[PDB]
């Protein structure tokens, strides 16, 4: 047997950290974010929120190997605006859309329905 | 003279032989890299080529 | 504004040569109203609905940003300089691979054909007035198509 | 089990060095199976990609310089063609010709009828794919192939 314990798919390891940031040297003003113990559910959404932002030149993510829980996000922005701030803002923005979605949903359920609970 | 010898080498008259160093592909690279214009006059003296 | 390599208003002779025809991309066969220049060109018919009866304006340019070069590539959506005609309905970017006429004869070098490639969408022009502008060069040339007139 | 034998394997037997076989001076390995059908399907002249799909593919490439090429169609909307994205993969300036020879086009006389871009012919220059679908004839283990020219 060689199969990992299935919980090891999502629990962070005690010697690891959740995100890691490394600069790219091929082009000016760019970054590489490492997200550990995460999957397409997270990776794909953050890609779409960043591409919505018009200051972002490039955004993409790739899961380096399927057996290996980790994703990388490359983002590149204009010199006038740090790429890190776009990422933080992109999450907060996303957090805001989901919060509004949750409030509208509960209220929509609250609409003249019965057996709602 | 080389042409006459070469007919004796290949009496069946095939044009396809195995050789090192693809000369057409190298020449083709020279045109592509030096950006040689096919229309503009070349800057090359033939005796330099022969030597 | 870009230094104009070629400029004309074209009429469509046919949309399906050989007739074989395909999706998204379609091969136009055209003729310039000067009746001294010929054109064969692919266009993305899915996003630019052409018609057989349509009369097109075609322009060819060596640049977009006023006069200086653009060989940077990297399309840069962040630019906002009104240097581009951008006024045209259909624009393509591409490279020239062949150009191509009889020159063997006495003084020949008369009547000329250019082959252009816009990322795998092919183009062919015949002329003699474009003799100063056609070059087998790196990715640089732009096709701007507009209006389809009236 | 030693540094001498590890050196001898790394230098002599290692797989990027077993590529063009002396068994018949053509590559031993070229693109196979499912990818090969997907490369055919991908290089066709009708394939177009939005800014998002190109960025995603660029992200999977390895030696990518980091400069998104200008899309072959700027207007009415950004579009990259298939051949174009493929040109980022082809090394520094590898350059083939011909190798169109699938069923398509014609059994030798049709293309001479002036070359009406019948789209089969596979032309590449300065390491940039100019036209035409890729297949077993270009990428396969055939003597004249693209993989042969890279090596």
UniProtKB/Swiss-Prot annotation, chain A:
A Pfam family matched in the record: RNA_pol_L_2
Gene Ontology molecular-function annotations: DNA binding; DNA-directed RNA polymerase activity; LRR domain binding; protein dimerization activity
Coiled-coil blocks: none
Compartment(s): Nucleus
Keyword set, alphabetical order: Acetylation, DNA-directed RNA polymerase, Nucleus, Transcription
Function: Core component of RNA polymerase II (Pol II), a DNA-dependent RNA polymerase which synthesizes mRNA precursors and many functional non-coding RNAs using the four ribonucleoside triphosphates as substrates.
Gene3D superfamilies linked to this entry: RNA polymerase, RBP11-like subunit
InterPro entries, alphabetized: RBP11, RBP11-like, RBP11-like_dimer, RNA_pol_Rpb11_13-16kDa_CS, Rpo11-like
Modified residues (N-acetylmethionine): 1
GO biological process terms, semicolon-separated: transcription by RNA polymerase II
Gene Ontology CC, one term: RNA polymerase II, core complex
Tissues with expression: Ubiquitously expressed. High expression was found in heart and skeletal muscle.
Protein name, entry field: DNA-directed RNA polymerase II subunit RPB11-a
Family: Belongs to the archaeal Rpo11/eukaryotic RPB11/RPC19 RNA polymerase subunit family.
Assembly behavior: Component of the RNA polymerase II (Pol II) core complex consisting of 12 subunits: a ten-subunit catalytic core composed of POLR2A/RPB1, POLR2B/RPB2, POLR2C/RPB3, POLR2I/RPB9, POLR2J/RPB11, POLR2E/RPABC1, POLR2F/RPABC2, POLR2H/RPABC3, POLR2K/RPABC4 and POLR2L/RPABC5 and a mobile stalk composed of two subunits POLR2D/RPB4 and POLR2G/RPB7, protruding from the core and functioning primarily in transcription initiation. Part of Pol II(G) complex, in which Pol II core associates with an additional subunit POLR2M; unlike conventional Pol II, Pol II(G) functions as a transcriptional repressor.
Curated annotation (Swiss-Prot), chain C:
GO CC list: cytosol; nucleoplasm; nucleus; protein-DNA complex; RNA polymerase I complex; RNA polymerase II, core complex; RNA polymerase III complex
Localization per Swiss-Prot or TrEMBL: Nucleus; Nucleus, Nucleolus
Transcription as UniProt keyword: yes
Listed GO MF terms: DNA-directed RNA polymerase activity; single-stranded DNA binding
One GO BP: transcription by RNA polymerase II
Matching InterPro entries: NA-bd_OB-fold, RPABC3
Residues found modified as N-acetylalanine: 2
Region (Non-specific ssDNA binding): 16-40
Family that this chain belongs to: Belongs to the eukaryotic RPB8 RNA polymerase subunit family.
UniProt xrefs under PANTHER family: DNA-DIRECTED RNA POLYMERASES I, II, AND III SUBUNIT RPABC3
Function: DNA-dependent RNA polymerase catalyzes the transcription of DNA into RNA using the four ribonucleoside triphosphates as substrates. Common component of RNA polymerases I, II and III which synthesize ribosomal RNA precursors, mRNA precursors and many functional non-coding RNAs, and small RNAs, such as 5S rRNA and tRNAs, respectively.
Subunit-structure text: Component of the RNA polymerase I (Pol I), RNA polymerase II (Pol II) and RNA polymerase III (Pol III) complexes consisting of at least 13, 12 and 17 subunits, respectively. Pol I complex consists of a ten-subunit catalytic core composed of POLR1A/RPA1, POLR1B/RPA2, POLR1C/RPAC1, POLR1D/RPAC2, POLR1H/RPA12, POLR2E/RPABC1, POLR2F/RPABC2, POLR2H/RPABC3, POLR2K/RPABC4 and POLR2L/RPABC5; a mobile stalk subunit POLR1F/RPA43 protruding from the core and additional subunits homologous to general transcription factors POLR1E/RPA49 and POLR1G/RPA34.
Protein name: DNA-directed RNA polymerases I, II, and III subunit RPABC3
Natural source organism: Homo sapiens (Human)
Curated annotation (Swiss-Prot), chain D:
Cell compartments where the protein resides: Nucleus; Cytoplasm; Chromosome
Post-translational modification summary for this protein: The tandem heptapeptide repeats in the C-terminal domain (CTD) can be highly phosphorylated. The phosphorylation activates Pol II. Phosphorylation occurs mainly at residues 'Ser-2' and 'Ser-5' of the heptapeptide repeat and is mediated, at least, by CDK7 and CDK9. POLR2A associated with DNA is specifically phosphorylated at 'Ser-5' of the CTD by CDK7, promoting transcription initiation by triggering dissociation from DNA. Phosphorylated at 'Ser-2', Ser-5' and 'Ser-7' of the CTD by CDK9 (P-TEFb complex), promoting transcription elongation. Among tandem heptapeptide repeats of the C-terminal domain (CTD) some do not match the Y-S-P-T-S-P-S consensus, the seventh serine residue 'Ser-7' being replaced by a lysine. 'Lys-7' in these non-consensus heptapeptide repeats can be alternatively acetylated, methylated and dimethylated. EP300 is one of the enzyme able to acetylate 'Lys-7'. Acetylation at 'Lys-7' of non-consensus heptapeptide repeats is associated with 'Ser-2' phosphorylation and active transcription. Regulates initiation or early elongation steps of transcription specially for inducible genes.
Family, similarity comment: Belongs to the RNA polymerase beta' chain family.
Function per UniProt: Catalytic core component of RNA polymerase II (Pol II), a DNA-dependent RNA polymerase which synthesizes mRNA precursors and many functional non-coding RNAs using the four ribonucleoside triphosphates as substrates. Pol II-mediated transcription cycle proceeds through transcription initiation, transcription elongation and transcription termination stages.
Protein name per Swiss-Prot or TrEMBL: DNA-directed RNA polymerase II subunit RPB1
Organism: Homo sapiens (Human)
Gene from which the chain derives: POLR2A
Residues of the full protein shown: 507 to 657 of 1970
């Amino acid at each position: 047997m060689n199969a990992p314990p299935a919980f090891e798919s999502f629990l962070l390891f005690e010697g690891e950290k959740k995100i890691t940031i490394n600069k790219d040297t091929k082009v000016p003003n760019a970054c590489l974010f490492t997200i550990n113990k995460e999957d397409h559910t997270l990776g794909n959404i953050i890609k779409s929120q960043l591409l919505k932002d018009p200051q972002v030149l490039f955004a993409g993510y790739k899961v380096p190997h399927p057996l290996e829980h980790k994703i990388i996000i490359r983002v590149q922005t204009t010199p006038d605006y740090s790429p890190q701030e776009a990422f933080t803002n992109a999450i907060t923005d996303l957090i805001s859309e989901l919060s509004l979605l949750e409030e509208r949903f509960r209220v929509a359920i609250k609409d003249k329905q019965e057996g709602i609970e | 003279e080389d042409r006459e010898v070469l007919r004796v080498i290949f009496p069946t008259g095939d044009s396809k032989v195995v050789l090192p160093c693809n000369l057409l592909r190298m020449i083709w690279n020279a045109q592509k890299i030096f950006h040689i214009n096919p229309r503009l006059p070349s800057d090359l003296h033939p005796i330099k080529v022969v030597e | 504004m870009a230094g104009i390599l070629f400029e004309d208003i074209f009429d469509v002779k046919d949309i399906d040569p050989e007739g074989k025809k395909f999706d998204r991309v379609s091969r136009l066969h055209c003729e310039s109203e000067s009746f001294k220049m010929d054109l064969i060109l692919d266009v993305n018919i899915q996003i630019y609905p052409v018609d057989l009866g349509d009369k097109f304006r075609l322009v060819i340019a060596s640049t977009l940003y006023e006069d200086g070069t653009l060989d940077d590539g990297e399309y840069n959506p962040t630019d906002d300089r009104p240097s581009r005609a951008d006024q045209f309905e259909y624009v393509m970017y591409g490279k020239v691979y062949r150009i191509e006429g009889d020159e063997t004869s006495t003084e020949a070098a008369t009547r000329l054909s250019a082959y252009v490639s816009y990322g795998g969408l092919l183009m062919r022009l015949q002329g003699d007035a474009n003799n100063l502008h056609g070059f087998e060069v790196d990715s640089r040339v732009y096709l701007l198509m507009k209006k389809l007139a009236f | 089990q030693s540094l001498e034998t590890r050196a001898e394997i790394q230098e002599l037997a290692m797989v990027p060095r077993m590529i063009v076989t002396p068994q018949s001076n053509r590559p031993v390995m070229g693109i196979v199976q499912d990818t090969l059908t997907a490369v055919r399907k991908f290089t066709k002249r009708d394939v177009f990609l939005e800014r998002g799909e190109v960025m995603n593919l660029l992200m999977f490439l390895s030696t990518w310089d980091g400069k998104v090429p200008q899309p072959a169609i700027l207007k009415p909307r950004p579009l990259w063609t298939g051949k174009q994205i493929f040109s980022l993969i082809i090394p520094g300036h590898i350059n083939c010709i011909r190798t169109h020879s699938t069923h398509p086009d014609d059994e030798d006389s049709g293309p001479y009828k002036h070359i009406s871009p019948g789209d089969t012919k596979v032309v590449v220059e300065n390491g940039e794919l100019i036209m035409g679908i890729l297949c077993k004839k270009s990428l396969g283990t055939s003597a004249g192939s693209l993989v042969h020219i890279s090596y």
